Ligand binder design. Sequence first.
Ligand SMILES: [Ca+2]
Ligand SMILES: [Ca+2]
Ligand SMILES: [Ca+2]
Ligand SMILES: [Ca+2]
Ligand SMILES: [Ca+2]
Ligand SMILES: [Ca+2]
Ligand SMILES: [Ca+2]
Ligand SMILES: [Ca+2]
Lengths: 321, 321, 321, 321, 321, 321
Amino acid sequence: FFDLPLEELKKYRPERYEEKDFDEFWEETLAESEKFPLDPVFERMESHLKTVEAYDVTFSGYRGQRIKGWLLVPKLEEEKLPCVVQYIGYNGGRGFPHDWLFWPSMGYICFVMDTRGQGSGWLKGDTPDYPEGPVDPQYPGFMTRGILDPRTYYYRRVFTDAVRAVEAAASFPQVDQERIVIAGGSQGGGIALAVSALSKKAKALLCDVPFLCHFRRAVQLVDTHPYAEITNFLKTHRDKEEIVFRTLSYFDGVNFAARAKIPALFSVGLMDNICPPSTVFAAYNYYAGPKEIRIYPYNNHEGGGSFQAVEQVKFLKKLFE
Amino acid sequence: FFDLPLEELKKYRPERYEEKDFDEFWEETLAESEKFPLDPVFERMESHLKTVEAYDVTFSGYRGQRIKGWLLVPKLEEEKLPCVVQYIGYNGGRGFPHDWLFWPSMGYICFVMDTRGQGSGWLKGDTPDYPEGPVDPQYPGFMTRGILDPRTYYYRRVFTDAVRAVEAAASFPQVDQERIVIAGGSQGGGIALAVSALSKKAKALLCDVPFLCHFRRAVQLVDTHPYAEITNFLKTHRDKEEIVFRTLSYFDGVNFAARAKIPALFSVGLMDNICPPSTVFAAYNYYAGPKEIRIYPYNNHEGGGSFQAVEQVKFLKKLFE
Amino acid sequence: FFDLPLEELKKYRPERYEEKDFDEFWEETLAESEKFPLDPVFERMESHLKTVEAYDVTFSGYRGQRIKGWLLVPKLEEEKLPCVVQYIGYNGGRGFPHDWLFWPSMGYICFVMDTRGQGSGWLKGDTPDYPEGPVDPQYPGFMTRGILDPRTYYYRRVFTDAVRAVEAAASFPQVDQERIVIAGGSQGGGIALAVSALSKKAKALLCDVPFLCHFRRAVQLVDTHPYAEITNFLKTHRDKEEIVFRTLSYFDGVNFAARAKIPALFSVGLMDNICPPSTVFAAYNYYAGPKEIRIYPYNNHEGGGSFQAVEQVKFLKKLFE
Amino acid sequence: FFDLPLEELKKYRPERYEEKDFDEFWEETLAESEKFPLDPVFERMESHLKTVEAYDVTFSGYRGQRIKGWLLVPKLEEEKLPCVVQYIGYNGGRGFPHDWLFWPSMGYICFVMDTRGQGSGWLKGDTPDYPEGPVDPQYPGFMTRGILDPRTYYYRRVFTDAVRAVEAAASFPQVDQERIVIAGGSQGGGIALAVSALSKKAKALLCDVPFLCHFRRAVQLVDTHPYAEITNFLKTHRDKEEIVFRTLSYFDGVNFAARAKIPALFSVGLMDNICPPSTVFAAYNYYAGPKEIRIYPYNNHEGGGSFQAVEQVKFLKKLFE
Amino acid sequence: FFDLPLEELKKYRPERYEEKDFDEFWEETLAESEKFPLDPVFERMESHLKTVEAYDVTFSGYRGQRIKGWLLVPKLEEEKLPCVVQYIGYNGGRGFPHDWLFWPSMGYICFVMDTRGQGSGWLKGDTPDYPEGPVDPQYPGFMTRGILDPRTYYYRRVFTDAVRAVEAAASFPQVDQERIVIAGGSQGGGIALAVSALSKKAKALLCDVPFLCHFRRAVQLVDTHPYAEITNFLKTHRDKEEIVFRTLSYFDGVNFAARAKIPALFSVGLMDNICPPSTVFAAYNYYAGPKEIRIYPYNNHEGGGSFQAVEQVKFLKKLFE
Amino acid sequence: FFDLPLEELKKYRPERYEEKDFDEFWEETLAESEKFPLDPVFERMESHLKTVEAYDVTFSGYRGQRIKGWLLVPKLEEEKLPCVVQYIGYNGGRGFPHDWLFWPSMGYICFVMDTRGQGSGWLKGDTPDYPEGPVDPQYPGFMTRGILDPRTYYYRRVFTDAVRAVEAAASFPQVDQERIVIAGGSQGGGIALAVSALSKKAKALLCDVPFLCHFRRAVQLVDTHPYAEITNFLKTHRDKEEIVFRTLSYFDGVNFAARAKIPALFSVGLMDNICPPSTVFAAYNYYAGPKEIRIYPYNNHEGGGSFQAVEQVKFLKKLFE
Ligand SMILES: [Ca+2]
Ligand SMILES: [Ca+2]
Ligand SMILES: [Ca+2]
Ligand SMILES: [Ca+2]
Ligand SMILES: [Ca+2]
Ligand SMILES: [Ca+2]
Ligand SMILES: [Ca+2]
Ligand SMILES: [Ca+2]
C-alpha cells in the first residue's frame, strides 16, 4: 500500500488542468482525419482455428495512414453479434489471431487494433508509425515521442486510429451496432478512455488498470516504466517542464473521463506501481457516465486477472438485456 | 547465454543415474492406484461460453484421491474429436474454464488437470494434496515435500494423477482415443514427460521448456526458483545430499525420456534461467521416440510463446494425417 | 523509518477484530489435545558438551502427535533451577544441542521446542507436521497451510504443541516451577505470546521482534517474507479475503496479548521490515500483564541482539528476587 | 572478469560477417548525401566563457538534414590550430558549450556533433531525427529503429552526419587540416570508428570503450543496455533474426576497423559489461592502421577516465611532431 | 517524491540541536591550527594545458598538517582575477589539473582542495589523514571515523583544512580578495557551508545538493551511502546513540548555516535520495545571509547539472557588479 | 557453482608470488614487537554467567599497542585445560563474553581476540588501531588501509596482534600449552593461517571459509565485499596496481600456508562468493602440515555451520588423544 488510503482514493478529485482549446484540438484532429476514406478491408485468412473465423484488417486511422488489426468472428448462427474493440498494452501489438480468443468464445465479435510503431516488447506488431516530419530529441520509448507539441505527440495519432477502429468494426455486416464495446487494460485502457469521449459509436467501456492518467501525479509517485520515460526526459530537459505537461494535458484520461457518457466498468489494483491507484481513481471519479469499479486490494498491475474477465462478461450481459 | 554453447547442447548426453528398481517402483505405484476405481465424473456447467461446452471434472488419481479438472468441448459437427491433456505450471491450478480456450478453438477437446496442493501463485486451484501420514521437515514449496523417500515424495502423487487423467480423458464419449495428446510447459512439461513413459493411452507429447529434468545439474547452474528450493534444503540438511538425489532420480524427466516411445515436439529457450537449456537438451537427447525441438536462442523462460503454439498445431495436424 | 513515528507507536491501539467464539475455539483445542497423555520422555545423550547435560526430548503436542526437543541442564549444585522454554524462528528447527548454550550458561535449564514441519531454512529440524486430512491449495510455506479454516490452520497445531511443551518442561524433576519462562523471537515471539495467554504454567514472557501480530496491517505495510505468503495467496484467491482474515484472527498475537497476565519483556526494531514496529506495538500496547519494551531505533529485524540478551538476564534476575 | 582471458582477447579475431555490397552501400549513401550542399554555418555566441570563443554550428548531414553542434576555439596566438571532432555517447547530445572544455584547454579547436533524435538521457540535445517515411515497429530506443533494412536504419543517418561533420570542421579557417582528430567513447567510439573508414579528411582516431561492435557476440554476452534493446526486439520478432543481423553487419565497427588506415589510440575496460572487452578487442585486432590500446583491467565502462585523457594528449602530441 | 512536499519543505525549520560550547569549540580549533604557519607553496607544473597555468599547491591545514591542491590560473590580461575555492565530493580527491577546467574557462582562478585520506572512490587524491592518536572502532569510511568525541572526529580536521585553504588562495598575488567564492556539491557543499560560517575571507557561497546536514533526519529517511555509515555504526554500538549525535551536532551544516552571513546560491534535487531535500532545505531555511535556491523537481543527486553551472556564473557576475 | 569444478579445485596449485624478503619482513616485524613486554592482564568480571568464569583481557600486540579480549574458563575439575584462540570476522569485535560460549561448553578455555579498529558492523569492539603516522588515501574499510607499503599495511598490525595473542593465552596458568588451538572463519581464518606460520606456540589450526587468500584471483572472480574494496581502489588508482599486489603478497594466506606445519582442519563452501572456493583451495593445497578439508557443495559463505562445529570438536579430540 504505497498510495492514498482507500477511503481517500474514493473521494480523490484533484483539480483538473487542461488548455481552453482542448475540445477544438480534438475536433480539428478528427475532422482532418475524416477527410480520408476509412476504406476498411476484411480479408478472410487461412487458419487452423475451427470455432472462429479470422480476418486480416486494414483501415485508415490518423491522416489516412493504414493500420492493421484482426477480426475474430465466432461461428454462431445469430445474424448480428455484439462486438468488443480491443486495444493493446504498452510494447504489444496484434500478435496472432489465436492470442485474442476470449471474447469470441463468449459470443462477441472481436476487433483487435494493432498499435503503430510498437509491437516489439511482449507481442509482435505489424503497423508502423508515420511522424509529422522531424522526430525531435526523445527518451527511448513512445511516451516522449513528439512531446514538445500536442500536434506532433505520438498519442494524437494512436487515439485517432482508435476512434477510427470503432468505425471500422461498425462497418462489418455481422456487427450489432447497438452492442459495440471498447476495451483495454493499461495503455489499452487509456486508449479506450480517450475513445469513450471522442467516439460516437461506442456503447460501453471496459477500462482496466488504466495508463495515461493524471501524468503529473504518476511521475512524482512511481519510478517504474513507462511513466519513468517522462521523468527521465524532464531530468535532462530541465527548461521543458511546463511545455511537457501542457502537451500531456491533451491526452490525459482524467480530462477525457470528465467528457465520457457511456456506461463503464473499471478495475484497479491497490498495490499497482505501474498505474498507481490514485491516477486510476482520479479518472474513475471524474468519469461522467454510469460507472462501476472493481477494487483488488492485494493485486499489483495484474489487477483482477481472470476474475475481472468474469466480471466483465456479467456486466455486459446485464447492461445489454 | 549462461549455459553450454548450442553445438555442445546438441550433443549433451550426460551419464544417467537411476536406481536398479526404477521400473519396479513405477509398476507398483501404478498398480496400487489402479485398485481404486477411476470413477470419472463430468458435469456440464452453466457458463457464458458460447463456442465451447464446459464440464467440471473429478477423477481418482493417486490412491483413490479425488482430483479436479476442466473439460472443454468445442461445438463442432464431428462426432469424435482429438484431445489435449493439459498439465499446469508451478504454483498454478485449473483456474476458470475460459483460461484454456486455445485447444478447443483449434478443434480439440481439452482436459485440464488441476495440480494437487498448489493453485495459489498465479492461477487458482481447487485440489488438495493428501500426504502419506507425516509431512517431514521441508523448505517452503513442493520440491522438497517428502523428498527423503521416493514413496512419500510429492511428485509420485502428481505423476500418478497425471497418468490417471489420460484414462479419464479417454473415458469421455466424444474423445477420439487414437488422437490423445499430452501437453505441458515448465512443471507441466516435466509431468507430461513422466506420462509419456508411464501411460499406454497417450499418442503424442508437447513438451515446452521442461522442468523436473537433470536435477543435479539444475541445482548447480541456477539460483532461481523453483530449483533453489532443493539447494536451500541441502544448505541446511548437509547430511542428506545422497538421499535427496537418490529420491529425485525416480522423478527425473531424463530417465523417463529414455523410456518414452511416442512422437514429441519439444521447445527450449537458450536464455532460460528457470529451466536451463542443458537440462532440457539432456531430456530431449535421451528421448527415445520420434522427436523434434524448436530452439529459441534469445528467449528466457517464455520460450517460443505464441510462435510455438503455431508450431504445435502444425505438428499435430501433420502427425495425425 | 518506514512506519508510524515513535510517539504514535506508543499510543497505537488499533480496533481489535476477533470472532465471538475465540475463547471457546482455544478451550476446545486444548481440551481435545489433553485427552492424549503428555508422555514426556527425556533421554540423556552422548555429547562432547562438558558444562551442560543434554537430553533428547519427546512429548505429545497437538492431538497426541509426538514433538521433538532438547533439554540442556547446566552442571550446577542447585537442586531446583529456573527454566527457559525456547521457541524457534521461521524455517528453523531444534538443530543441535550446542546451538542453545546461552540460557544454560546463565544457570537456566533450557527446553528447546522443535517446530513441526519446518527445520529446513537456517537450522535443521526433526519433527513432522500431521495435517487434518486434506492439505488444501496453498502458497509455498507455512503461513497459508490450512488457512481456509481455523480448525485446519497450521498454527493451531504449533500453538498447541507450544502449550504442551511448558507442561513437559515442568515435568522435569530439577525444574523450579515458580521460575518457568517462555521465550522467543520473530515466529518464536508469536508462539510465546499465544502461550502467555493459553498456558497456566508460564511465569514470565520474553518476546522479541514478534511475528504473527496484526496480520491485516502487516500485509499492507511490507512485501517481505514470511508475511508476503499471505498477500501472494490473496492475489490469487481473490474470493477468499474475508475467510483468510477470519481464520488469522484466531492466531493473532494482539488478541492473545489482550488476555495475557504474566510479566513480559518485549523488544522492537524501528527499522524492522520483517516484523514492522506497528504490529509489535499493537501487541505490546494490548498486553494485559506487567510489561516493559526495549526499543532499538536504528535496528532492523536483528533487534537488540546481544544487548537485548543482557537486558533479558537482568530482567529475570530482578523479577524472580 | 566475465569475458575471455586477456591472453585470448589479444588474439581474438572472430570470423567477420558482411554482405558483398558493404562498400557500395556506403559509397551510394555518401554520394547521395554529397548532392546537397554542406552549407556549414558558424555563429559566434554570447557566453561567459573567457578563454574560449564558442560558436553555434549547423551543417547538412544525411540527405541535407540540418545537424547542430558547438565549435570551441581556444584564444591562442597560433593562426592554425589542431582540431578534435567529438562524437557523443548514447542518450546524450551537445549540451552547453562549457560541457566540452577539455580539448580547447589543451590548445585544440573542438567540434562537438549533436546526435540526431537523442539528447534526453544524460545531456540535452537540439537535433531531430528525420526518418525514411514509415517508422517500423521497434523496441524503445535507437538500436532497433529501422533495423529491418539497412537503408532505413537509424545509424546510417548518424554515420553520414558524422562523416559530414569532419567536412564542416575542416571548413573553419583557423583549423589545421593536417591535424584533424576524430574522437569518441561508447556510442561516440563506434561512430568515430565508422568515420575512420569513410572519411578522407580524418588524420587520427581516439576510440574509447567502443559500442556498435561485434553485435552477435555483444547480445549473447551481456543483458545490459543499450545492446539489450536488440535482444528484446529478437525475443518478440522471432522470425526476424537473420534480417536483424544482416542489417547490423553494415554498421559493425569490426567491419569498418578492417578498412581504416589512420593512426588510432583505443581503450578498453576488462570489467566493462556495457561494451564487453571481446567486442572492443575484435574491432581493435582488425583495425588496419597503426594502433595502440590502453588496457584497464579493473575498470568497468568508465574505462581509463582522466588517466586515459592524459594518454590521448601525449599520443597526439607525439603523432603530430 | 519520497520527502516532504515542496510547500512544506519551503517552511521546514526543525528545532536545532547544538551544545552550548559550539562556538568555543570552533574558536579553539581554529586558534590552535593558526599557531602553525600557513606556509602556502605554489609550484608551476609542466602541463599540456595551453589556456591555463597549473600550480601544485601545499598549505598547512589542521594542526600544521600539509594538504595538497591545484591552482588553475586562466591566461588573461587582467592583473587581479576572481577566485573559486573548490571542495570535493565524498571519496574524491584533487585528481589532475584538467579535471577542474570550468571556472578557469569562465575567467576565475580556481583553488582545488584535496580531501585528506579519501581520493580512492571516483577521483584519485594525494593527501593523507593524520589522526589524533588512536583510531577507534569504526564502520568502513569517513563518517564514523573518531565519531565518539568531536575533538577526534574526521570532519574537524577537514573543516579546518577548508578554512585554511581560503587563506592560501588569498595569498596568491593575482587573486582579487574582494571576489573569493567558496564552492562545493554534496560533501563539498557541506564543507563549504562550514567555511561560510568560520572563514573571514570568503565573499560568496555556492552550495549544491549539500551533504553533512540534519544528520538525525538524514539517517531515518534514507538507507543510501554515505549517511548509512552512521546508521550501521549505531546498529552495532547500541549504547552510543546520544554520544554519536552530540558529536555530529558540531559538524552539522544547519548549525553553520544559522551563523553564515555571506550571499549564497543553493541547489536541491527533490528526488535526491543521497542528500534528501528536507536536510538541504533545513540548512537553506536557517541560512542567515542573502540567499537563493534553484529547485530541480525531477532530479536525483545529479541536481541541476550543467544548468546549475550556468546559474552559478550568472549569479556571481550579478553579485560582483 | 561459479568457480572451478571440484576435480580442478582439488588439483589447483597456482604459481605463488612473493618477494625475496618475505621471511625477513616477518622476522623483523615480530622481533620489533617482542622488544615491548607482553604485559598480559586478566581481570575477572562480574557476570551473570554461571558455568564459565569470564576475564577481561589486555595484552601488547603490534609495537606495544594494547589489545582487548575475553577469556572464558569453563568451571571444571581438570587443573589444565585445552585452549582455543579465536579470531573474528570482518567488521566484528569481541562483543560480550556470552557471544563465545561454544568452546567453553566443550571444555576448552577460549581466548577471544578483539580486532583493532573494527567492531562496528555486526558485533561491537573496543580496540582502536594506531597507524604508522600518515593514514594515506584509501577506499572505505580495512583492506586498502596503508596498502601502498607493507610496513604501513593494516594487516601487518593485525597479524602481529594475533601472534602475540597466542603468547597471552599461553601465559594463563590453567591453559595446557600442549593443546593450544588457533581458530577462525573468514577474516578470522586468514588471520589464523598467518599465525599457523608465524607462531611457535600453536598446536592445531581450525580454518573455515578463509579470507585474505589468493588476492589477485579473488579480485578477478567476485565483486562482493570485502575483496571489492581492493578492486575499487584499483579502479581509481590506475597507476598503483603493481604496488598494491606487491604489498598484498606479504599478507596472502597461500604464502603462509606453504610454511605452516601444524595439523589443520579446513572448510569450504562451493557456492561461497565472499571467499571463493579457488582461493580457499589454493591455500589448502599449499598447506604444508597434516591437513583435512570439509567440503560443503551447496553452501555459500555460511559454510558448514553447526555441522562444521561438530567436525571440529571430533577432529581435536582425536588429534590430542
Ligand atoms: Ca474550448
Ligand atoms: Ca529394474
Ligand atoms: Ca466467547
Ligand atoms: Ca532418543
Ligand atoms: Ca563490394
Ligand atoms: Ca557558547
Ligand atoms: Ca610539487
Ligand atoms: Ca628470504
